[PDB]
């Protein structure tokens, strides 16, 4: 038979890859970092509280100027906040109220959203009239849209529940590239700082690294036991972190091609909803189902602090580009800005 | 008192936005939201047509006796249900459609599991969900006329080995309804409203209206502490 031959060849290739990875694992990161001082105890306080949403908040995203942000709720509203003064700049009503993601253009001129309607809608913020209007509606996915990120004013990459990712052209509305290879729903994606590669995580408990220009998969990372809900990229672009339903976070290195550290505790038995890094990459922030956020020493895998103050799930969090504040959204319909105290 | 003129103008704009948001929320809070479910083809489109008279999620709006309904149909979502069912946590009620003529048909996948036993599994999964612990279910049992004819040709013992055996519509309908209503475990905080669907298009919206009115009244009594 030929099916058995191909299955055996695939198994042999998997064994060869496992042996090649095991060859280069000489010492663990804990042993290497057992000679650096602990970060200490991290304490943060709530500076602002943004109210005005009437239902669960599902996503948020910072602007590149570290002052404006956009948030999406299932009451059918996108809201743009000025965080310094708490003022609302724009409120945008959506045609479909089942939104699950939102994005902010790095130029500051456009916003994007999508959800259970399988469509990514683009909104223009700078018009001769005083209103915000829809610019384009990208359609072509056969499952719910779970994430979207801008590359420039004319390019955007999305992940769908039909086990696929896509790179679009906003001016024409056509899919420029398609990324297939996952066997489960793709739940998140993250762009590298140079925007030449991106990493995705799916419900088959695996993550993948994709080349944007050539449109193929270079590397596949496994090790989790359940679905991966969140993914983030290390500041220097050579590592990334994943959060999953098995109540652990994990760190992967691109050049070593394997997992470096696991962040878990015996008192945590809930899934991770969101994950992010600090400006230097020393701290890792993760949001959980048990209503609070945990701060981890990335290099030593120790707990360092807790952000508490929400009455329901922490569904989204983000860190500014200058690293001055954190933002957390929640199912209790509030957003909070957090800062450290000298 | 330390705000420049443009700062005050921006604050005024923000206040106007707040007012509009509050008005929109007040308008939207006075509507009934229903989630429509069923296993495969079970007359669900027929029910949609009865109440009324690719895109992911389908919404139908209608009015009956000065009350506004919003019915959500999610049959086009072929992805994992576990990842988006919690979006419907706060609906008023779930309308579950079941075809009575499927008691002897077999799904053409394994040729071993008949369609009715798949509908029972779906109903068990939805009724005992953790997101729907206090949500009422309106159960529609469709195709009674076809069931009446099919009773004679095929006995109900094909689907239920433990049936006592009457081989009549009156007893078979009661047996099937009892089998479906027996799957509700926490039968103290949840109710089931059962209806045998008729051809006429006016006796179904009335039943939905009555059930929704009962649900709203009980919610208000529970809120006031009287229930």
């Amino acid at each position, epitope marked *: 038979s030929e099916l058995d031959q191909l299955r055996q060849e695939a198994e042999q290739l998997k064994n060869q890859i496992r042996d090649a990875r095991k060859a280069c694992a000489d010492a663990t990161l804990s042993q290497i970092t057992n000679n650096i001082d602990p970060v200490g105890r991290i304490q943060m306080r709530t500076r602002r509280t943004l109210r005005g949403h009437l239902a669960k908040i599902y996503a948020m995203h910072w602007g590149t100027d570290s002052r*404006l942000l956009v948030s999406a709720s299932q009451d059918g509203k996108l809201i743009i906040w000025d965080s310094y003064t708490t003022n609302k700049v*724009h409120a945008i009503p959506l045609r479909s109220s089942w939104v699950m993601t939102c994005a902010y253009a790095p130029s500051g001129n456009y916003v994007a959203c999508g959800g259970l309607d399988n469509i990514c809608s683009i909104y223009n913020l700078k018009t001769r009239e*005083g209103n915000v209007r829809v610019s384009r509606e990208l359609a072509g996915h056969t499952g719910y849209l779970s994430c979207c990120r801008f590359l420039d004013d004319n390019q955007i990459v999305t992940s769908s529940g039909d086990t696929t990712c896509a790179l679009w052209d906003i001016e024409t509305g056509q899919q420029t590239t398609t990324f297939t290879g996952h066997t489960g729903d793709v739940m998140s994606l993250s762009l590298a700082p140079d925007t030449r590669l991106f990493v995705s995580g799916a419900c088959d408990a695996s993550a993948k690294l994709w080349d944007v220009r050539e449109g193929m998969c270079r590397q596949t990372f496994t090790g989790h036991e359940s679905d991966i809900n969140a993914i983030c990229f290390f500041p220097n672009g050579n590592a990334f972190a994943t959060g999953s339903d098995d109540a652990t976070c994990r760190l992967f290195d691109l050049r070593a091609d394997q997992e470096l550290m696991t962040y878990s505790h015996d008192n945590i038995i809930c899934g991770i909803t969101s994950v992010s890094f600090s400006k230097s990459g020393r701290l890792l922030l993760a949001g959980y189902d048990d209503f609070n956020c945990n701060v981890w020493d990335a290099l030593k895998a120790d707990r360092a602090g807790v952000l508490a103050g929400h009455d329901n799930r922490v569904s989204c969090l983000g860190v500014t580009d200058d690293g001055m504040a954190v933002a957390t959204g929640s199912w209790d319909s509030f957003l909070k800005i957090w800062n450290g105290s000298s | 008192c*330390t705000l420049s003129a*443009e700062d005050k103008a921006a604050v*005024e*704009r923000s206040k106007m936005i707040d007012r509009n948001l509050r008005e929109d929320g007040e308008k939207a809070a006075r509507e009934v939201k229903l989630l429509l479910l069923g296993a495969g083809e079970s007359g669900k489109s027929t029910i949609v047509k009865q109440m009324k008279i690719t895109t992911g999620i389908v919404e139908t709006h209608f009015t009956f006796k000065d009350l506004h309904f919003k019915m959500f149909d999610v049959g086009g979502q072929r992805s994992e249900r576990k990842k988006w069912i919690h979006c419907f946590e706060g609906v008023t009620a779930i309308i579950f459609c079941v075809a009575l003529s499927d008691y002897d048909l077999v799904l053409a996948e394994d040729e071993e599991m008949n369609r009715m036993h798949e509908s029972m599994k779906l109903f068990d999964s939805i009724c005992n969900n953790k997101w729907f612990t206090d949500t009422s279910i309106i159960l529609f049992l469709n195709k009674k006329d076809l069931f009446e004819e099919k009773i004679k040709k095929s006995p109900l013992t094909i689907c239920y080995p433990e049936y006592a055996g009457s081989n009549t519509y009156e007893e078979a309908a009661a047996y099937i309804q009892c089998q479906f209503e027996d799957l509700n475990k926490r039968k103290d905080t949840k109710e089931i409203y059962t209806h045998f669907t008729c051809a006429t298009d006016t006796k179904n919206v009335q039943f939905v209206f009555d059930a929704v009115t009962d649900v709203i009244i009980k919610n208000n009594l529970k809120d006031c502490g009287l229930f």
Partner: single-chain antibody
Amino acid sequence: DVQLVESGGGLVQPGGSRKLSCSASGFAFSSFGMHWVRQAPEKGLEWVAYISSGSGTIYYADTVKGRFTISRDDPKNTLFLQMTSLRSEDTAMYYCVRSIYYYGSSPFDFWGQGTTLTVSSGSDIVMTQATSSVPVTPGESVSISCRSSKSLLHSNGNTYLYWFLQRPGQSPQLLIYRMSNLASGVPDRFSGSGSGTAFTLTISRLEAEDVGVYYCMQHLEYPLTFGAGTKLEL
């Protein structure tokens, strides 16, 4: 396109009354605050009145308080100025101006065409433009200076100075808002800088359409004073 059209001018005997109308088209009228500004014959600009978005705030100049009333009608997209007991110093051309206020916006960015009105026979910030006329030739570079009596720099990083240019036989046009930013549709040759009280506007090159009068305005506090502009000659 954005349009503001004015009506209601003409000849009026002293002590009479008149109503001026301003009809808007092509933009979301209800979300903009609106201003009435006027220009006396062979003189400079002078702010008159302001009505906010939603008509929750109203401001008048001290020289017209008690005789002028500003109002808006949003369903029909109209702005009205009703004026009574008209003295001989009210003969002028009137302009309808739109402005919107949020973080990052550009107020005063569109002006109407104006209508003419002929009448028969205290702690305000002073804005000073020393030079009143300049001859110049194409291809060169020009600097225009403006000075203030108060520091326009607020304690939030913003300096509230605006630049306008009026070509002969035309309405004024915005060039620079908040002392550094460039308006939409304006060439990149123009630039602005300053400090506290002294401000400058520089034209890196020069063309044949830059002739006209240049005005500096302050928006730190009402009554929103102007300064007598500088005329550029060929």
